[PDB]
Amino acid sequence: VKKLINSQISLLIGKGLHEFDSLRDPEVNDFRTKMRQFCEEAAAHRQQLGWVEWLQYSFPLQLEPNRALLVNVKFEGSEESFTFQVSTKDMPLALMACALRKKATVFRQPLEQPEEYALQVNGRHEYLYGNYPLCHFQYICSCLHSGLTPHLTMVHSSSILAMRDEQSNLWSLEQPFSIELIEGRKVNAMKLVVQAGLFHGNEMLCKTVSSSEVNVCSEPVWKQRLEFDISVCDLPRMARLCFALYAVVDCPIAWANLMLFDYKDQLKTGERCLYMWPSVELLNPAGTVRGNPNTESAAALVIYLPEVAPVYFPALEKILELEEELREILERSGELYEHEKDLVWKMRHEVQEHFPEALARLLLVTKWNKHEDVAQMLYLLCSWPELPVLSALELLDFSFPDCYVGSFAIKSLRKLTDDELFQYLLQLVQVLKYESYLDCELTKFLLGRALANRKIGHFLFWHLRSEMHVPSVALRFGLIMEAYCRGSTHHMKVLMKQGEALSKLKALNDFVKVSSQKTTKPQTKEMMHMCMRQETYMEALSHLQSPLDPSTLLEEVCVEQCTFMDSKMKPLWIMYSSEEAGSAGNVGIIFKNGDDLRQDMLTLQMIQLMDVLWKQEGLDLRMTPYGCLPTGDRTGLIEVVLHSDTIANIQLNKSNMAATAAFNKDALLNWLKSKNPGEALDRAIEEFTLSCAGYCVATYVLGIGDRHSDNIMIRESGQLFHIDFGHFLGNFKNRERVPFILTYDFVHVIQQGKTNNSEKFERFRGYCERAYTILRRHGLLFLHLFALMRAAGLPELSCSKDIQYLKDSLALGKTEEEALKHFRVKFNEALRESW
Ligand SMILES: Cc1ccccc1-n1c(Cn2nc(-c3cc(O)cc(F)c3)c3c(N)ncnc32)nc2cccc(C)c2c1=O
């Protein structure tokens, strides 16, 4: 069985486990056994969970960030159902009580405590339970706003337990730090030079030192000493030595980093061969500290670390052993002059005692190239009060490379709710890329959270799996996924089923791409359907959890409704239906291969976050933050928003249609009227107005560009939403400041088809202003999350200029009054542009 599980982990993660063995690497070996133990202990805990706790693990609640309500309720093993009038303020227990009383009357009564049950949403992996009014559950809210009757199933605790059960598994060294540069074996045109620097995060620990110049041969020889302007004793624990090999008459060729201490805190010595990474400001301190795995091809640098005595970084116990104030004035950009730094440092105890949230500022002023100073910082850090989540998120930035700081940040982040963790998971995964060692507090934190919440576990898996084609992270991410699989054998098989479906979709899309070059769309479509109706495809593509949202069940693939877009990357449109789910089982996924989906997903997650922040302040802008999930090399899934069309399509203004128009400016309003006749129209126009305000503000703040009428859609409900986000932060395809945008046809709908309607139009302006002012108040959250996202290496999120864009859009250097005046100037400028 162990062999079997080993082969399925290998297949699931995209890497053979024998490849870990072949490295014969103690660090890999230690990571694997330790994390295996950790994860297996998590599994043992899970299998003995109480039944309600099991539900919290496998089906965590979906909550929103008096009134009449009809609900249909049936019991697990029956077609017989009951429709009940309850209240939106009623709790699940009261509803379950009604169900059990009816069951007792219809089926003659003994009878049975509602406390023995939970309510499943029919045909979904989603459950309603807990002391929450029905209107606090997203599902109930969904139905209320869309009009539908909630359909729920009474599921007994013994049924839940069966699910659980079926799913079981030294200061002494004063001399200058020096190295010997020996030789290389590379390819260029000039002479060669090696630049080397010592870094602690972004900060240089002393000036960089450079090689002598040597002719551009294939196997250069230097045999030279590089001495650095720092004492061996002052090397901080997380010191990085960074190399750049380049040609000079400058032509960059390669780079390589390593830690000066190994994973066991031993100071490194003596000889190393550094397999370099090809060069895409020469030195790359944020780059990985592990060598390039393509040793057959990679340029290589051979160096010598001198045996300076075995020496280890001192233990914490040893480390610990070792007037009326402008303080407050400067202490709220955050960049300071040298004298200001001295004051903060001098006043470090006062920072700790009275301004614990200014830790980052203090950290940025400590001299990391002086061991006494670091000791003095660590001493205060070991007694530092826990910080808020927001503050901890900042402390994960590559600017804070020290391991004790890293560990402090994680400690402060443990109070993250699962909902918050889910909101920030993308960024936390990216931060793994900054880690210096395999076994680290971030990795253990994420694994523990993932093992305790199957939804976290699902998205953690896919975030790691989607990057296995990236050599720099393949090893780390492969190891994390293996350990995770050790912690849930059952979830591994659920994930394999998703991977099988994705393998078939890739093969299907490759066929579609070939066929559509040779024949008409109707013909390729019929060929697609014949391919899908093969038993191997019908089986692989049916009965899985959606990778986009594991609570959505993709049951029967609906072949006749599947198609493809006959342009660009030819993405597939795949429809599903589910008898048990009814209408809500009719769902679609888009499979696209050829584009990197990371930027689309990041934009959508930021829009989701805006929607949550707005809703927390009682503002619902009726947004459509649909799912988007990278799954592989320029491959992933996008959630289909049904009953929606593009503005472009509507504006075609085809004849013989319900929307056909005397003036093109009436096409959209006509379309809305056709979908929302009579009294329904007023609601739809309001839905349009709200969502238009949300998207106007979202795209302005994020600097979203390349917006045509084919990348804005509208739902039949009236909700406008943007799709397919290729460009943001003013980087348009170079760097411009994107203005606020008001489109005339949209203003026309908001004004209910009237030329002048200041009453409706100024309401819309008020929504935009409210939305903008709310985001400003959380400005730091967006700044911190985008800073962490720099780890992803998106070309439109690369540097400080990109993050400056958000500082300017949110006008965070301004007062709230000043920011609004400025926003109004932009809104007004945007208004006159409107024809
Ligand atoms: C549904 C529709 C109406 C008008 C014009 C285009 C489309 N449409 C669209 C428009 N579109 N694009 C997206 C979309 C969004 C993304 O962020 C990324 C992406 F690649 C696609 C989308 C979505 N999520 N939900 C609903 N419609 C969406 N996408 C398709 C993708 C694959 C295959 C097909 C046949 C389509 C497709 O027909």
Side-chain angles (χ1 to χ4, degrees), residues 738-745 747 761 824-835:
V738 324
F740 197 88
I741 305 298
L742 287 176
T743 307
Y744 180 75
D745 273 14
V747 179
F761 178 81
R824 282 168 183 159
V825 164
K826 299 292 176 188
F827 184 100
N828 283 349
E829 278 172 7
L831 185 48
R832 58 192 66 112
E833 282 297 320
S834 203
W835 270 69

PDB file of all heavy atoms in Angstrom, residues 738-745 747 761 824-835:
ATOM      1  N   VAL A 738      -3.305  55.758 -15.430  1.00  0.00           N
ATOM      2  CA  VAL A 738      -4.631  55.557 -16.024  1.00  0.00           C
ATOM      3  C   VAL A 738      -5.682  56.442 -15.329  1.00  0.00           C
ATOM      4  O   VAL A 738      -5.727  56.521 -14.099  1.00  0.00           O
ATOM      5  CB  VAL A 738      -5.066  54.039 -16.191  1.00  0.00           C
ATOM      6  CG1 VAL A 738      -3.872  53.154 -16.564  1.00  0.00           C
ATOM      7  CG2 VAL A 738      -5.766  53.500 -14.970  1.00  0.00           C
ATOM      8  N   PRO A 739      -6.513  57.134 -16.121  1.00  0.00           N
ATOM      9  CA  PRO A 739      -7.472  57.998 -15.453  1.00  0.00           C
ATOM     10  C   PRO A 739      -8.704  57.210 -15.010  1.00  0.00           C
ATOM     11  O   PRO A 739      -8.914  56.072 -15.443  1.00  0.00           O
ATOM     12  CB  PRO A 739      -7.844  59.001 -16.547  1.00  0.00           C
ATOM     13  CG  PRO A 739      -7.714  58.201 -17.835  1.00  0.00           C
ATOM     14  CD  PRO A 739      -6.688  57.127 -17.588  1.00  0.00           C
ATOM     15  N   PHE A 740      -9.495  57.813 -14.136  1.00  0.00           N
ATOM     16  CA  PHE A 740     -10.813  57.296 -13.835  1.00  0.00           C
ATOM     17  C   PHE A 740     -11.602  57.254 -15.139  1.00  0.00           C
ATOM     18  O   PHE A 740     -11.473  58.164 -15.964  1.00  0.00           O
ATOM     19  CB  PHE A 740     -11.513  58.214 -12.843  1.00  0.00           C
ATOM     20  CG  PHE A 740     -12.683  57.580 -12.165  1.00  0.00           C
ATOM     21  CD1 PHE A 740     -12.507  56.845 -10.991  1.00  0.00           C
ATOM     22  CD2 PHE A 740     -13.958  57.715 -12.697  1.00  0.00           C
ATOM     23  CE1 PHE A 740     -13.581  56.261 -10.362  1.00  0.00           C
ATOM     24  CE2 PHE A 740     -15.042  57.125 -12.081  1.00  0.00           C
ATOM     25  CZ  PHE A 740     -14.863  56.408 -10.904  1.00  0.00           C
ATOM     26  N   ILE A 741     -12.409  56.208 -15.327  1.00  0.00           N
ATOM     27  CA  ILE A 741     -13.159  56.053 -16.566  1.00  0.00           C
ATOM     28  C   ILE A 741     -14.665  55.989 -16.372  1.00  0.00           C
ATOM     29  O   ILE A 741     -15.173  55.155 -15.610  1.00  0.00           O
ATOM     30  CB  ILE A 741     -12.691  54.797 -17.393  1.00  0.00           C
ATOM     31  CG1 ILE A 741     -11.183  54.841 -17.681  1.00  0.00           C
ATOM     32  CG2 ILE A 741     -13.495  54.659 -18.699  1.00  0.00           C
ATOM     33  CD1 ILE A 741     -10.704  56.028 -18.538  1.00  0.00           C
ATOM     34  N   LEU A 742     -15.363  56.874 -17.089  1.00  0.00           N
ATOM     35  CA  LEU A 742     -16.817  56.859 -17.207  1.00  0.00           C
ATOM     36  C   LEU A 742     -17.222  56.686 -18.665  1.00  0.00           C
ATOM     37  O   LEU A 742     -16.949  57.555 -19.497  1.00  0.00           O
ATOM     38  CB  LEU A 742     -17.411  58.172 -16.659  1.00  0.00           C
ATOM     39  CG  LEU A 742     -17.392  58.315 -15.133  1.00  0.00           C
ATOM     40  CD1 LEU A 742     -17.899  59.690 -14.679  1.00  0.00           C
ATOM     41  CD2 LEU A 742     -18.218  57.198 -14.517  1.00  0.00           C
ATOM     42  N   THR A 743     -17.882  55.570 -18.968  1.00  0.00           N
ATOM     43  CA  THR A 743     -18.350  55.274 -20.323  1.00  0.00           C
ATOM     44  C   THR A 743     -19.782  55.721 -20.553  1.00  0.00           C
ATOM     45  O   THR A 743     -20.677  55.376 -19.772  1.00  0.00           O
ATOM     46  CB  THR A 743     -18.281  53.750 -20.606  1.00  0.00           C
ATOM     47  OG1 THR A 743     -16.964  53.269 -20.317  1.00  0.00           O
ATOM     48  CG2 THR A 743     -18.643  53.441 -22.053  1.00  0.00           C
ATOM     49  N   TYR A 744     -20.001  56.416 -21.674  1.00  0.00           N
ATOM     50  CA  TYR A 744     -21.278  57.046 -21.982  1.00  0.00           C
ATOM     51  C   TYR A 744     -22.489  56.121 -21.972  1.00  0.00           C
ATOM     52  O   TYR A 744     -23.540  56.483 -21.440  1.00  0.00           O
ATOM     53  CB  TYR A 744     -21.208  57.745 -23.345  1.00  0.00           C
ATOM     54  CG  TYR A 744     -22.495  58.429 -23.750  1.00  0.00           C
ATOM     55  CD1 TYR A 744     -22.881  59.631 -23.149  1.00  0.00           C
ATOM     56  CD2 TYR A 744     -23.322  57.880 -24.734  1.00  0.00           C
ATOM     57  CE1 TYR A 744     -24.049  60.280 -23.525  1.00  0.00           C
ATOM     58  CE2 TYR A 744     -24.499  58.514 -25.114  1.00  0.00           C
ATOM     59  CZ  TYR A 744     -24.853  59.717 -24.510  1.00  0.00           C
ATOM     60  OH  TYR A 744     -26.011  60.358 -24.879  1.00  0.00           O
ATOM     61  N   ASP A 745     -22.365  54.956 -22.611  1.00  0.00           N
ATOM     62  CA  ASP A 745     -23.456  53.969 -22.619  1.00  0.00           C
ATOM     63  C   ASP A 745     -23.834  53.503 -21.197  1.00  0.00           C
ATOM     64  O   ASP A 745     -24.984  53.167 -20.947  1.00  0.00           O
ATOM     65  CB  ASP A 745     -23.113  52.745 -23.494  1.00  0.00           C
ATOM     66  CG  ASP A 745     -23.490  52.927 -24.977  1.00  0.00           C
ATOM     67  OD1 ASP A 745     -23.776  54.056 -25.436  1.00  0.00           O
ATOM     68  OD2 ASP A 745     -23.496  51.909 -25.704  1.00  0.00           O
ATOM     69  N   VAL A 747     -23.354  55.421 -18.290  1.00  0.00           N
ATOM     70  CA  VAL A 747     -23.986  56.603 -17.707  1.00  0.00           C
ATOM     71  C   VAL A 747     -25.441  56.678 -18.183  1.00  0.00           C
ATOM     72  O   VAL A 747     -26.360  56.953 -17.407  1.00  0.00           O
ATOM     73  CB  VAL A 747     -23.156  57.877 -18.023  1.00  0.00           C
ATOM     74  CG1 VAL A 747     -23.808  59.123 -17.434  1.00  0.00           C
ATOM     75  CG2 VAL A 747     -21.744  57.713 -17.468  1.00  0.00           C
ATOM     76  N   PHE A 761     -27.622  60.150 -11.365  1.00  0.00           N
ATOM     77  CA  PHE A 761     -26.189  60.208 -11.631  1.00  0.00           C
ATOM     78  C   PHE A 761     -25.365  60.583 -10.387  1.00  0.00           C
ATOM     79  O   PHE A 761     -24.270  60.044 -10.169  1.00  0.00           O
ATOM     80  CB  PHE A 761     -25.861  61.165 -12.799  1.00  0.00           C
ATOM     81  CG  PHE A 761     -24.390  61.262 -13.052  1.00  0.00           C
ATOM     82  CD1 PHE A 761     -23.740  60.277 -13.807  1.00  0.00           C
ATOM     83  CD2 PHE A 761     -23.632  62.266 -12.459  1.00  0.00           C
ATOM     84  CE1 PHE A 761     -22.370  60.318 -13.999  1.00  0.00           C
ATOM     85  CE2 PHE A 761     -22.252  62.305 -12.652  1.00  0.00           C
ATOM     86  CZ  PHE A 761     -21.627  61.323 -13.421  1.00  0.00           C
ATOM     87  N   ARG A 824     -12.396  63.628  -6.753  1.00  0.00           N
ATOM     88  CA  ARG A 824     -13.452  64.367  -7.452  1.00  0.00           C
ATOM     89  C   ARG A 824     -12.945  65.045  -8.718  1.00  0.00           C
ATOM     90  O   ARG A 824     -13.646  65.080  -9.736  1.00  0.00           O
ATOM     91  CB  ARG A 824     -14.111  65.393  -6.536  1.00  0.00           C
ATOM     92  CG  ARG A 824     -15.101  64.757  -5.585  1.00  0.00           C
ATOM     93  CD  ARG A 824     -15.530  65.714  -4.499  1.00  0.00           C
ATOM     94  NE  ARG A 824     -16.425  65.019  -3.590  1.00  0.00           N
ATOM     95  CZ  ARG A 824     -16.691  65.390  -2.347  1.00  0.00           C
ATOM     96  NH1 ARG A 824     -16.147  66.487  -1.827  1.00  0.00           N
ATOM     97  NH2 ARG A 824     -17.528  64.658  -1.629  1.00  0.00           N
ATOM     98  N   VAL A 825     -11.727  65.575  -8.651  1.00  0.00           N
ATOM     99  CA  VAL A 825     -11.113  66.208  -9.822  1.00  0.00           C
ATOM    100  C   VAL A 825     -10.988  65.151 -10.930  1.00  0.00           C
ATOM    101  O   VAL A 825     -11.371  65.391 -12.068  1.00  0.00           O
ATOM    102  CB  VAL A 825      -9.756  66.898  -9.471  1.00  0.00           C
ATOM    103  CG1 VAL A 825      -8.921  67.209 -10.735  1.00  0.00           C
ATOM    104  CG2 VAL A 825     -10.002  68.176  -8.655  1.00  0.00           C
ATOM    105  N   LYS A 826     -10.518  63.963 -10.569  1.00  0.00           N
ATOM    106  CA  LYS A 826     -10.398  62.844 -11.521  1.00  0.00           C
ATOM    107  C   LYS A 826     -11.753  62.389 -12.055  1.00  0.00           C
ATOM    108  O   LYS A 826     -11.901  62.119 -13.258  1.00  0.00           O
ATOM    109  CB  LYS A 826      -9.662  61.655 -10.875  1.00  0.00           C
ATOM    110  CG  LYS A 826      -8.225  61.945 -10.430  1.00  0.00           C
ATOM    111  CD  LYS A 826      -7.311  62.183 -11.633  1.00  0.00           C
ATOM    112  CE  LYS A 826      -5.909  62.568 -11.204  1.00  0.00           C
ATOM    113  NZ  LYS A 826      -5.092  62.974 -12.387  1.00  0.00           N
ATOM    114  N   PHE A 827     -12.741  62.304 -11.163  1.00  0.00           N
ATOM    115  CA  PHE A 827     -14.088  61.857 -11.534  1.00  0.00           C
ATOM    116  C   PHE A 827     -14.721  62.852 -12.506  1.00  0.00           C
ATOM    117  O   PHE A 827     -15.355  62.454 -13.488  1.00  0.00           O
ATOM    118  CB  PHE A 827     -14.965  61.678 -10.276  1.00  0.00           C
ATOM    119  CG  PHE A 827     -16.354  61.128 -10.556  1.00  0.00           C
ATOM    120  CD1 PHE A 827     -16.640  59.775 -10.347  1.00  0.00           C
ATOM    121  CD2 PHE A 827     -17.376  61.969 -11.004  1.00  0.00           C
ATOM    122  CE1 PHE A 827     -17.933  59.261 -10.592  1.00  0.00           C
ATOM    123  CE2 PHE A 827     -18.651  61.479 -11.266  1.00  0.00           C
ATOM    124  CZ  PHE A 827     -18.942  60.121 -11.059  1.00  0.00           C
ATOM    125  N   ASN A 828     -14.545  64.140 -12.212  1.00  0.00           N
ATOM    126  CA  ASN A 828     -15.018  65.220 -13.079  1.00  0.00           C
ATOM    127  C   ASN A 828     -14.299  65.283 -14.414  1.00  0.00           C
ATOM    128  O   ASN A 828     -14.951  65.383 -15.453  1.00  0.00           O
ATOM    129  CB  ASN A 828     -14.961  66.568 -12.356  1.00  0.00           C
ATOM    130  CG  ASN A 828     -16.087  66.733 -11.366  1.00  0.00           C
ATOM    131  OD1 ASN A 828     -17.039  65.945 -11.350  1.00  0.00           O
ATOM    132  ND2 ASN A 828     -15.992  67.754 -10.527  1.00  0.00           N
ATOM    133  N   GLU A 829     -12.968  65.197 -14.386  1.00  0.00           N
ATOM    134  CA  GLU A 829     -12.180  65.023 -15.620  1.00  0.00           C
ATOM    135  C   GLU A 829     -12.697  63.842 -16.441  1.00  0.00           C
ATOM    136  O   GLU A 829     -12.849  63.944 -17.658  1.00  0.00           O
ATOM    137  CB  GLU A 829     -10.687  64.848 -15.315  1.00  0.00           C
ATOM    138  CG  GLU A 829      -9.925  66.168 -15.087  1.00  0.00           C
ATOM    139  CD  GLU A 829      -8.482  65.954 -14.602  1.00  0.00           C
ATOM    140  OE1 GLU A 829      -8.020  64.792 -14.563  1.00  0.00           O
ATOM    141  OE2 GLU A 829      -7.810  66.952 -14.248  1.00  0.00           O
ATOM    142  N   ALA A 830     -12.993  62.730 -15.765  1.00  0.00           N
ATOM    143  CA  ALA A 830     -13.518  61.529 -16.436  1.00  0.00           C
ATOM    144  C   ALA A 830     -14.921  61.748 -17.018  1.00  0.00           C
ATOM    145  O   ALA A 830     -15.294  61.152 -18.042  1.00  0.00           O
ATOM    146  CB  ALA A 830     -13.528  60.353 -15.487  1.00  0.00           C
ATOM    147  N   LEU A 831     -15.689  62.604 -16.354  1.00  0.00           N
ATOM    148  CA  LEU A 831     -17.066  62.898 -16.748  1.00  0.00           C
ATOM    149  C   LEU A 831     -17.148  63.673 -18.077  1.00  0.00           C
ATOM    150  O   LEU A 831     -18.015  63.401 -18.917  1.00  0.00           O
ATOM    151  CB  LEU A 831     -17.754  63.679 -15.621  1.00  0.00           C
ATOM    152  CG  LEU A 831     -19.240  64.006 -15.744  1.00  0.00           C
ATOM    153  CD1 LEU A 831     -20.060  62.778 -16.142  1.00  0.00           C
ATOM    154  CD2 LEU A 831     -19.728  64.599 -14.434  1.00  0.00           C
ATOM    155  N   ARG A 832     -16.246  64.635 -18.259  1.00  0.00           N
ATOM    156  CA  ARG A 832     -16.221  65.413 -19.498  1.00  0.00           C
ATOM    157  C   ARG A 832     -15.665  64.625 -20.677  1.00  0.00           C
ATOM    158  O   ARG A 832     -16.060  64.865 -21.818  1.00  0.00           O
ATOM    159  CB  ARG A 832     -15.531  66.772 -19.324  1.00  0.00           C
ATOM    160  CG  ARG A 832     -14.088  66.778 -18.835  1.00  0.00           C
ATOM    161  CD  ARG A 832     -13.695  68.213 -18.433  1.00  0.00           C
ATOM    162  NE  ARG A 832     -14.462  68.659 -17.263  1.00  0.00           N
ATOM    163  CZ  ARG A 832     -13.955  68.879 -16.050  1.00  0.00           C
ATOM    164  NH1 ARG A 832     -12.651  68.745 -15.820  1.00  0.00           N
ATOM    165  NH2 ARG A 832     -14.757  69.263 -15.063  1.00  0.00           N
ATOM    166  N   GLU A 833     -14.783  63.664 -20.397  1.00  0.00           N
ATOM    167  CA  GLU A 833     -14.311  62.741 -21.430  1.00  0.00           C
ATOM    168  C   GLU A 833     -15.464  61.936 -22.033  1.00  0.00           C
ATOM    169  O   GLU A 833     -15.505  61.724 -23.253  1.00  0.00           O
ATOM    170  CB  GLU A 833     -13.232  61.791 -20.891  1.00  0.00           C
ATOM    171  CG  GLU A 833     -11.839  62.405 -20.773  1.00  0.00           C
ATOM    172  CD  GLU A 833     -11.238  62.842 -22.116  1.00  0.00           C
ATOM    173  OE1 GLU A 833     -11.395  62.126 -23.130  1.00  0.00           O
ATOM    174  OE2 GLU A 833     -10.606  63.915 -22.149  1.00  0.00           O
ATOM    175  N   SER A 834     -16.377  61.480 -21.172  1.00  0.00           N
ATOM    176  CA  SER A 834     -17.607  60.794 -21.572  1.00  0.00           C
ATOM    177  C   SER A 834     -18.273  61.572 -22.729  1.00  0.00           C
ATOM    178  O   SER A 834     -18.800  62.669 -22.522  1.00  0.00           O
ATOM    179  CB  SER A 834     -18.526  60.686 -20.342  1.00  0.00           C
ATOM    180  OG  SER A 834     -19.472  59.642 -20.454  1.00  0.00           O
ATOM    181  N   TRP A 835     -18.224  61.005 -23.940  1.00  0.00           N
ATOM    182  CA  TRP A 835     -18.388  61.768 -25.223  1.00  0.00           C
ATOM    183  C   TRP A 835     -17.982  63.231 -25.164  1.00  0.00           C
ATOM    184  O   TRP A 835     -17.750  63.840 -26.204  1.00  0.00           O
ATOM    185  CB  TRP A 835     -19.789  61.631 -25.845  1.00  0.00           C
ATOM    186  CG  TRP A 835     -19.892  60.464 -26.785  1.00  0.00           C
ATOM    187  CD1 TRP A 835     -19.866  59.143 -26.441  1.00  0.00           C
ATOM    188  CD2 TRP A 835     -20.023  60.506 -28.220  1.00  0.00           C
ATOM    189  NE1 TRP A 835     -19.978  58.360 -27.565  1.00  0.00           N
ATOM    190  CE2 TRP A 835     -20.073  59.165 -28.673  1.00  0.00           C
ATOM    191  CE3 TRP A 835     -20.102  61.542 -29.167  1.00  0.00           C
ATOM    192  CZ2 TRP A 835     -20.199  58.828 -30.039  1.00  0.00           C
ATOM    193  CZ3 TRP A 835     -20.232  61.207 -30.526  1.00  0.00           C
ATOM    194  CH2 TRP A 835     -20.280  59.859 -30.943  1.00  0.00           C
TER     195      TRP A 835
END
